[PDB]
Design a protein around this ligand. Structure first.
Ligand code: MG
Ligand code: MG
Ligand code: MG
Ligand code: MG
Ligand code: MG
Ligand code: MG
Ligand code: MG
Ligand code: MG
Ligand code: MG
Ligand code: MG
Ligand code: MG
Ligand code: MG
Ligand code: MG
Ligand code: MG
Ligand code: MG
Ligand code: MG
Ligand code: MG
Ligand code: MG
Ligand code: MG
Ligand code: MG
Ligand code: MG
Ligand code: MG
Ligand code: MG
Ligand code: MG
Ligand code: MG
Ligand code: MG
Ligand code: MG
Ligand code: MG
Ligand code: MG
Ligand code: MG
Ligand code: MG
Ligand code: MG
Lengths: 205, 122, 147, 52, 127, 52, 104
RNA sequence: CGGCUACCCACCCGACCCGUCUUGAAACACGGACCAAGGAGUCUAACACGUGCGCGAGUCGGGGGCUCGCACGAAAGCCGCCGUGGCGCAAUGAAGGUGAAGGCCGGCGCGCUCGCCGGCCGAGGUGGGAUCCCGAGGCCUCUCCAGUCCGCCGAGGGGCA
RNA sequence: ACCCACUCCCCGGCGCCGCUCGUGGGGGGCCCAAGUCCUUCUGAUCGAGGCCCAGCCCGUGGACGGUGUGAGGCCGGUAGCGGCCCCGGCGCCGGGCUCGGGUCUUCCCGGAGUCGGGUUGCUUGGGAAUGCAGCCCAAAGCGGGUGGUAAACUCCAUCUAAGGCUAAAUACCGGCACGAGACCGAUAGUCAACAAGUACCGUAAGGGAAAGUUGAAAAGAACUUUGAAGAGAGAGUUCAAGAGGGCGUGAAACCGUUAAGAGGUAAACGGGUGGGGUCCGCGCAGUCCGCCCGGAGGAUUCAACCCGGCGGCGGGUCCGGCCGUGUCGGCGGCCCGGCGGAUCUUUCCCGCCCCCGGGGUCGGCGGGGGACCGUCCCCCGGACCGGCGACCGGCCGCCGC
């Protein structure tokens, strides 16, 4: 079976595969159906923007992607409470709420409540009769626009601190080194052993 | 850009008929029938051609003006010569010898003019 | 292109390019990698050494995200920032050094390669190699650890 | 290279007074082989499958 | 050019729907043009054929200026019969010859209560 | 039915072919040798006004 | 064309015609059958938009982000002038147009 | 009158019935009574090499989205803060992990089987190596004078892959 | 349960006007433009044209049917085309329910033969056993599950299982309709293009075919004669019966007849001739063409040369102007010009933030404004090519009139 020289192959075609083969011959039709559905939904909900519910600022969990930031599902109950709006009214306002998410960092809490405040300040809703408060006499001629695309108020485009340039300090030549990381790893590896040794030494005293 | 156009026209082009072992280029402005670079009349900046007159006597000579290129409306000047068998033969020869104007294919133009005059004689 | 394949020029030849003595039988030697240890051992040991057996310890539920650590070299350390930064540092108006953060570009560890320019730099990375750390300090640069 | 001017023609057939310059796309390398390759490989996209 | 995605250009489908058309569609298919002096009078181009109207052959073998009258409209065969357009058999008996209604031009129509309505509807639609 | 019907082409090669065709459409020889009747045409790139 | 105002209606019934847009240029319509050199009729705006859609060798295209005009291989594609130039024929060899056929 | 041939006939010579298994086939080895139609190396996934094309330490929108409803449009055009991602740009260990710049000059400490310092270009050296450069020497109407004019080369140098 | 400052609304029928994005859904009928001249043909849709506004329409030149090959002769097609009938929602006139938000004080807060363990099977990539199941053992409330290697000690992170409902993107070789095809073209394509799951076969489960083409129109052969009839000889229709009721076209194997040739080593076959025959080209003692010159007779305008004159070629002055390739320059189009840049300007602004409404840059965050950088827009001044970018003035030398 093998030849002179070649990469050994293990094709996973030993099963009866020809009776289950998904050909994507309906891909243009599926894309057309999805586009027509999007257009119909946007036309039915015209005063509200596409992908209406605002989504919070979400950091990636894993260490591979924790350097960038992305969108999420909904704002936390703590963020809603700091914003000052009720939990159940945010859904009809247009704010997606995620009750399962917790808040561990005030650095993200302040960013989320600031995003919520910006959304609330930019938001303009329509009443049934002018007897409802928190509105104006004229609704900016359909708010200058009916529907928004790719994010209700703002995407999650990444920003970065500048830290343009600075003068090197005196001890920076001997501040850090590879030996520093090596010592850190050695201490993290031998932390508990040293504690047990100190314990058994104090036991003898 | 004569060779650049010839590298495209030498094949995959219209007017070309090679049903038998010989090939023919058959352009509206061409002296011989060979599909060659030295006889093609559509790619050069200077081209001479002869044709039987539409009235029924005489020979029309088409010359590439070269004054305005890429303007096929006035890119060709057409003259009519209706003389005896020798006066036209000498005028066509002078038209290529006095001016530089593509000194080759002079014999080709002369042979085609004589051959069409032979058919116009009856 | 069937008109360009070989089967067209094989019409009229009874064996169809497979010989009269040994015909084209359906899997005459075996199906797949059959007999990797016998009657194919010569090929399997000449062209695929180390194929049979186990070597290392097993790691259940391995995640490729933990071992994610791209490396950047010193010759590429200047391709991350723009070109005007290098000329502004070479102008040398004072003892100020540009800061080149590799975390933005996507590298976590900096590895050592030679031929560095004589301009001081401030590098911020999670990991540094010994050779790179000595070579950046031999020019007057600084290394900053991040997390 | 040289990019001359091309006059505009009116709806009656004569040349208008305005004039526009020749774009740089018309001086691109003429590649019949590349054109034929692209045409051959792109014409196979609109065909429908057939089977027994 | 065709643009409605609900009408077909298939030759086989068109032939099938034409050969198996119901009787109320065969009467619309079997339509004949009107004469020039009558077209300007009625402001209509064509009109279906009935049993009482007169007609004049314009093309075929039995063509000419002799005015004729229809006697049978054979919807099944998409044909009409004329009393004077006939032929002799082997034994000498007469039999009508079939000519398609598209190859014949009408000169006279039976003024019926429904025919006038169809005429005025076509005229108002042509406007 | 799962035969490889469609073939994908690089966008750069697609644009290369388009520019090649546009540059070839501006030469009178290449368009005359295709079969078009351009003997009476004043200018080969026919640029008309916006009224059309 | 560009910025349709009803030209498709006026050009949709002429046989052999083809309707094409500047923003959507199709090779199947520009070079039918695999042969280049199809006769084209442009508009003023359609002709002015080409410099911004494809760009020149100096500046890149504005509509397309990372696209530039293809590079040009032979700067002078005329072999006749190059072979007949004095610089080439200055250091050439003798023609030597003798046949030297077979001698009996 | 001239005419090869897909017409027929005769003589002279040579001439065993085709296909494949076999060292050996015309065989007393197998299949074929004859004729017409159909009939057998295809397609998918993966791998290796070679070739053509485009870009180039980058490359690829095949997955989705956008423009206008479209016969040709199940096409084509675009995304640019959609490059997430695949391949390559870094390898070596079972793993914890580590992870690629040489050469010249001068000085000091015992220039010590000896480290450091300062300046420079910056991927070492040897033997081959297409090509290129320099080049003694001689090659063009009577003469000392010349830049083109006729026009190759001994030897030597930096040396692609 | 107090305190505080607030909210008058929502949900189910009934009559109507105007719309809903392709301009909501379903159904019937209608809507542009030659059949005009001439000539082929059995038959026309074939064949050139319809005055200088290109014979007419075109948002309708797809397709079908019609004696063949139609944009205009006929349903049909384009058209936010019209008129008619039926169904569903958006706004408005009776009827029944009807206290939300925050702080503080007090109380309440949970699913059991189930988790888990032992054991035995099936399964999983899941390995000291991922999941399921059978038997046995079978609990707790600072508890229990999980944290990918079994076990003990300690800490940490996450969730609240043994109760339930829910459209979305997803799949569809059956069903009801539709559209399309680089597929098949009657031994192919579904077994089945046709009275096909039919004829037929086996007791039954079940197996399962073959089979399209007259003619434009039957106009399917009247009538006379032979034969009892099958059939045939005349005649008749059709352009055609050489299309006569499984009848378009009509090959090979095979067979009959006619003509030619040949015949004891079966026939056949390759090399080279001869004889006969069909047929082909020529008209066979009589057939080669074109150029120049010297002679023999006639008729014509031009050519030599000059003049009028247009059209093209060539370079000199690059002349009055055109643009390409580079360097400055008006710092001018930066506000009545564009992009990018981890290059800047915290003595610029706006919204936050630290310290003592206000003050302090003491520092930081997001957005906007503007300064320098590399690519682009106009005139002047010049550097090179005047080249496939081109005009006039003047000249030599051509062509036709
Ligand atoms: Mg092998
Ligand atoms: Mg199997
Ligand atoms: Mg062989
Ligand atoms: Mg082989
Ligand atoms: Mg073998
Ligand atoms: Mg063997
Ligand atoms: Mg079909
Ligand atoms: Mg064989
Ligand atoms: Mg054997
Ligand atoms: Mg044997
Ligand atoms: Mg044999
Ligand atoms: Mg045998
Ligand atoms: Mg035997
Ligand atoms: Mg036998
Ligand atoms: Mg066959
Ligand atoms: Mg990536
Ligand atoms: Mg027809
Ligand atoms: Mg038609
Ligand atoms: Mg009509
Ligand atoms: Mg527990
Ligand atoms: Mg716990
Ligand atoms: Mg643990
Ligand atoms: Mg563990
Ligand atoms: Mg539950
Ligand atoms: Mg549940
Ligand atoms: Mg669903
Ligand atoms: Mg096929
Ligand atoms: Mg059958
Ligand atoms: Mg009888
Ligand atoms: Mg027949
Ligand atoms: Mg028959
Ligand atoms: Mg005989």
């Amino acid at each position: 079976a093998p030849s002179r020289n070649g990469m050994i192959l293990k094709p996973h075609f030993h099963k009866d595969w020809q009776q289950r083969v998904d050909t994507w011959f309906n891909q243009p039709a599926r894309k057309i159906r999805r586009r027509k559905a999007r257009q119909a939904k946007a036309r039915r909900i015209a005063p509200r923007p596409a992908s209406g519910p605002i989504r919070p600022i979400v950091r990636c969990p894993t260490v591979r992607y924790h350097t960038k930031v992305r969108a999420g599902r909904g704002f936390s109950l703590e963020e809603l409470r700091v914003a000052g709006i009720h939990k159940k009214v945010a859904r009809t306002i247009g704010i997606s709420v995620d009750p399962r998410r917790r808040n561990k960092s005030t650095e993200s809490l302040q960013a989320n409540v600031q995003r919520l405040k910006e959304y609330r300040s930019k938001l303009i809703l329509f009443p049934r009769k002018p007897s409802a408060p928190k509105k104006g006499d004229s609704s900016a001629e359909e708010l200058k626009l009916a529907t928004q695309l790719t994010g209700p108020v703002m995407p999650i485009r990444n920003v970065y601190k500048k830290e343009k340039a600075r003068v090197i300090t005196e001890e920076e030549k001997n501040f850090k080194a590879f030996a520093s990381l090596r010592m850190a790893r050695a201490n993290a590896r031998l932390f508990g052993i040293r504690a047990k040794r100190a314990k058994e030494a104090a036991e003898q005293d | 850009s004569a060779h650049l156009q010839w590298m495209v026209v030498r094949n995959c082009s219209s007017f070309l008929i090679k049903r038998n072992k010989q090939t023919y280029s058959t352009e509206p402005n061409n002296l011989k029938a060979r599909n060659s670079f030295r006889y093609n009349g559509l790619i050069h900046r200077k081209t001479v051609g002869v044709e039987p007159a539409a009235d029924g006597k005489g020979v029309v000579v088409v010359m590439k003006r070269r004054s305005g290129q890429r303007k096929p409306a006035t890119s060709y000047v057409r003259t009519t010569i209706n003389k005896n068998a020798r006066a036209t033969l000498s005028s066509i020869r002078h038209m290529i010898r006095k001016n530089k104007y593509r000194p080759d294919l002079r014999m080709a133009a002369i042979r085609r003019a004589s051959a069409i005059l032979r058919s116009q004689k009856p | 292109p069937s008109r360009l394949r070989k089967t067209r020029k094989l019409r009229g030849h009874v064996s169809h390019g497979h010989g009269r003595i040994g015909k084209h039988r359906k899997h005459p030697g075996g199906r797949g990698n059959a007999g990797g240890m016998h009657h194919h051992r010569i090929n399997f040991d000449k062209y695929h050494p180390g194929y049979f057996g186990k070597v290392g310890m097993r790691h259940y539920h391995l995640k490729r995200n933990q071992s994610f650590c791209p490396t950047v070299n010193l010759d590429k350390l200047w391709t991350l920032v723009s070109e005007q930064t290098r000329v502004n540092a070479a102008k040398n108006k004072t003892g100020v050094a540009p800061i080149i953060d590799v975390v933005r570009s996507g590298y976590y560890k900096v590895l050592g390669k030679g031929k560095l320019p004589k301009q001081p730099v401030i590098v911020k990375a999670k990991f540094f190699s010994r050779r790179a750390e000595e070579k950046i300090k031999g020019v007057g640069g600084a290394c900053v650890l991040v997390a | 290279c040289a990019r001359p001017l091309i006059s505009v023609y009116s709806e009656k057939g004569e040349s208008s007074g305005k004039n526009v310059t020749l774009p740089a796309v018309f001086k691109a390398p003429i590649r019949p082989d590349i054109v034929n390759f692209v045409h051959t490989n792109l014409r196979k996209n609109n065909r429908q499958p057939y089977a027994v | 050019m065709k643009f409605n995605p609900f009408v077909t250009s298939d030759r086989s489908k068109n032939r099938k729907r034409h050969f198996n058309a119901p009787s109320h569609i065969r009467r619309k298919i079997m339509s004949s043009p009107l004469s020039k002096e009558l077209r300007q009078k009625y402001n209509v181009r064509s009109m279906p054929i009935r049993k009482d109207d007169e007609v004049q052959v314009v093309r075929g073998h039995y063509k000419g200026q002799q005015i004729g009258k229809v006697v049978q409209v054979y919807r099944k065969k998409y044909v009409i019969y004329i009393e004077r357009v006939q032929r002799e058999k082997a034994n000498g008996t007469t039999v009508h010859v079939g000519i398609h209604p598209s190859k014949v031009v009408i000169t006279r129509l039976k003024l019926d209560k429904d025919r006038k309505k169809i005429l005025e509807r076509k005229a108002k639609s042509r406007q | 039915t799962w035969r490889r019907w469609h073939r994908r082409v690089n966008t750069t090669q697609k644009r290369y072919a388009i520019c090649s065709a546009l540059a070839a459409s501006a030469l009178p020889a290449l368009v005359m040798s295709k079969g078009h009747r351009i003997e009476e045409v004043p200018e080969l790139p026919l640029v008309v006004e916006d009224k059309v | 064309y560009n910025e349709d105002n009803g030209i498709i209606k006026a050009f949709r019934n002429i046989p052999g015609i083809t309707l094409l847009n500047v923003s959507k240029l199709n090779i199947l319509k520009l070079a039918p059958g695999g042969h280049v050199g199809r006769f084209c009729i442009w508009t003023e705006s359609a002709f002015r938009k080409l410099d911004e859609l494809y760009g020149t060798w100096r500046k890149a295209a504005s509509l397309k982000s990372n696209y530039n005009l293809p590079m040009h291989k032979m700067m002078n594609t005329d072999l006749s002038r190059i072979l007949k130039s004095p610089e080439i024929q200055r250091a050439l060899r003798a023609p030597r147009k003798k046949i030297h056929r077979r001698v009996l």
